[PDB]
UniProtKB/Swiss-Prot annotation, chains A, B, C, D, E, F, G, H, I, J, K, L, M, N, O:
The keyword Membrane applies. The chain crosses the membrane at residues 22-42. It is found in: Virion; Host membrane. It is a single-pass type I membrane protein. This is Capsid protein G8P. Its main location: virion. The chain holds residues 24 to 73 of 73 of the full protein. Homomultimerizes. There are several thousands of this protein in the phage capsid. The keyword Amino-acid biosynthesis does not apply. It comes from Enterobacteria phage fd (Bacteriophage fd). Belongs to the inovirus capsid protein family. Self assembles to form a helical capsid wrapping up the viral genomic DNA. The capsid displays a filamentous structure with a length of 760-1950 nm and a width of 6-8 nm. The virion assembly and budding take place at the host inner membrane. One of its GO terms (cellular component) is helical viral capsid.
Length: 50, 50, 50, 50, 50, 50, 50, 50, 50, 50, 50, 50, 50, 50, 50
C-alpha cells in the first residue's frame, strides 16, 4: 500500500518496452509471411498450367 | 492477542501491494499471448493455403 | 505449579496472534497461486493451438 | 485435519477458474478448426474437378 | 518414548490434510489433461482429412 | 561411569521417539511422490500422442 | 542397509501404479492409430480409382 | 519513560538510512529484471517464427 | 583416526541403501522408455504409410 | 541518516558495474539470436521450394 | 565501478569465443542446405519430365 | 610452544578421519551421478528418434 | 591438483558408459531408418508404374 | 597480507582440479553431440527422399 | 584515538588478503562460465539444425 507508487512506473516501464519489441514479433511474421503466401501463389501458377 | 492490531495493517499493506503488481503478471501474459495466439493464426493462414 | 496460571494467558496471547498472521501466510500463497496456476492455463492455451 | 477447511475453498476457487478458461481452450480449437476443416473441403472441391 | 503420543496426532493431522489437497493435484492434472488429450484428437481430425 | 545408567534410558527414549516420527518423514515424501511420479506419467500420456 | 526394507514397498507401489497407467498410454496410441491407419486405407481407396 | 527521547532519533536515524538503501534493493531487481523480461521477449521472437 | 571405525559402517549402510533405490531410478526410466520408444515406432508405422 | 553518505557511493558503484555487464547479457542474446533468426530464414528457404 | 575492469575481458573472452563457434552454426546450416536445396532441384528434374 | 606436541596428533587424528569420510562424499556424488548422466542418455535416445 | 587422481576414473567410468549406450542411439536410428528408406523405395515402385 | 602465501596454492590447487574436470564437461557435450548432429543428418537423409 | 595506529595495518593486512582471494572467486565463476556459456552454444547448434 506504500513504497510501491514509484515501483508502479518500474513495471509500466518494462511493459511499455514489451509493446515496442512486440511490434517487431507481429511485423516479423508478416515480413516473412509476405513471401510465405506470395511464394504459395508462385507455385499455384506452376501446378495450374497442367 | 495484543500489540498485533496495528501490525494487521502491516500485512494488509503488503497484500494490497501484491494485488497491484499481480494485475501486471496477469495482463503481462495476456499482452504477450495476444501476439502468441495472433501469430499462431498468421502461420495457420500459411500452412492452410497448400 | 504456581505463578504460571497468569503466564498461561501470556502464551495463549502469542499463539492467538500466530493464528491471526498464519491466515495471511495461507491466503498469501493462494493470492499468488491464483495467478500462478491461472497463468499456467494461459500458456496451455498457447502451446495447445499447434 | 484442521486449518484446511477454509483453504479447501482456496483450491475449489482456482479449479472453478480453470473450468472457466478451459471452455476457451476447447472452443478456441473448434473456432480455428471450423475453418481448418471447412477450408480442407474448399480444396477438395478444387482437386476433385480434374 | 514419552511426550510424543499426543504429537503422533499432530503429524497424522498434517498428513491427513496432505491427502485432502493431494486429491486436487491428481484431479487438477486430469481436469487439464481432459482438454489436453481431447484437443489432440481435434487436430488429429484436422491432419487426417488430407 | 556412574550416575549415567538411568540417563542411558533418557536418550534411548529420545532416539526411540526419533524412529516414530522418522517413519513419517520417509512415508511423507512417498505420499507426495506417489502423485509426483504418477502425475509425470499423466503428462507423458499427453506429449506422447503427438 | 536398514530402515529401507519397508520403503522398498514404497517404490514397488509407485512402479506397480506406473504399469497400470502405462497400459493406457500403449492402448491409447493404438485406439487412435486404429483410425489413423484405417483412415489411410480409406484415402488409398480414393486415389487408386484414378 | 525518560532518557529515551534523544535515543528515539537514534533508531529514526537507522530506519531513515534503511529507506535510502531499500530504494536500491527495489530498483536493483528492476534494473536486472528490465533485461530479465526484455530478454524473455527476445527468445519469444525466436520460438514464434517456427 | 579413532572412533570412526564403527561409523565407517554407518555410511556403507546409507550407500548400500542408495544402490538399492538407484536400481529403481535406472529401471524406472527404462519401464517408461519401453513405451516411450515403442510408441515412437507406432507413429512411424502411421506417417510411413503415406 | 549519518555514516551512509560515503556508503551511497558503495551501491552506486555496484549498480554502475551492473549496467556494464547488463549490456553484455542484452547484446549476448542478440549476438546469438542474429543466427537464431537468420538460420530460421535459411530453413524457410528450404521448406518453401516444395 | 571498480574491480570489474579486469572482468570486462572475462566476458569479451566468452563473447569472442561465441563469434568463433557461431560461424559454425551459420556455415553448418548452409553445408546441410547446400544438399537440401540441391536435392530439391534433383526431384524437380524428376516431376518436370511428365 | 610446549604441551601441544601430543595435541598435534589430536588434530591429525580428526583430519585423517576427514579424509576417510571425504572419500564417501566424492564417490557418493559419483554413485548418484552414474545414473544422473546415464539416465540423461536414456532420454536423449527418446527425443532423438523424432 | 590432489584428491582428484582417483576421481579421474569416476568420469572416465561415466564417459566409457556413454560410449556403450551411444552405440545404441546410432544403430537405433539406422535399425529404424533401414525400413524408413527401404519403405520409401516400396512407394517409389508404386508411383513410378503410372 | 601474511599467512595467505601458502593458502594461494590451496585455491590454485582447487582451480587446477577444475580445469581437469572442465575438459570432461566440454568433451562430454561433444561426445553426445557427435551423435546428436550425426543422427540429425540420418533423418535428413530420410525426409529428403520424398 | 591512540593504540590503534599499529592495528590499522592489522585490518589493511586482512582486507589486502581479501582482494587476493576475491580475484579467485571472480575468475572462478568465469572459468566455470566459460564452459557454461560455451556449452549452451553447443546445444544451440543441436536444436537449430531441425
Amino acid at each position: 500500500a506504500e513504497g510501491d507508487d514509484p515501483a508502479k512506473a518500474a513495471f509500466d516501464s518494462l511493459q511499455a518496452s514489451a509493446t515496442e519489441m512486440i511490434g517487431y514479433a507481429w511485423a516479423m511474421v508478416v515480413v516473412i509471411v509476405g513471401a510465405t503466401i506470395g511464394i504459395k501463389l508462385f507455385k499455384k501458377f506452376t501446378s495450374k498450367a497442367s
